[PDB]
């Protein structure tokens, strides 16, 4: 497994009912483009950024989706270089509570990322995998058994209340 | 199927 080279967090908060923080460590190394794009993404330097935003797609056994800060639903956000950007490292794999890139078929990363919480090796080669939760893997285990509907959104709203840089 | 995409979701 890669080196992590920064940290952040994210505060997370279902309904007015707070979760607790998840803790993430970043490749810096493997891939400094992305990371820095998230990195920034998660202060807000720019404006924008993670803060306020939710997870619009859940799948138990599998994953938990977020940071459509712009639309809400999965059809948006933007990174730190314009509208999207190539993808840095592709070499390497996911594993449970690793930090991947959500995307549009390749070199088009934005700012949505995926937390896994089960082995999704047939993503592989495909999607940019660029940390791993150090802490508050419970939290995510939390948020992956919630309420969702059909397109499997949540009923109540899984918010990032506060996010940060450790 | 199993995928992470932004915009279409396929199977």
Redo the contacts between chains.
Sequence with gaps: EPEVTAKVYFDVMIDSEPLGRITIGLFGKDAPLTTENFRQLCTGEHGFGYKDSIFHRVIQNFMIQGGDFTNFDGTGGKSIYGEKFADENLNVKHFVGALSMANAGPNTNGSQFFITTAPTPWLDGRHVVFGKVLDGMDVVLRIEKTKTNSHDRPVKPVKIVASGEL | X????????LA
């Design positions: 199993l995928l992470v995409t932004a915009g279409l979701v």
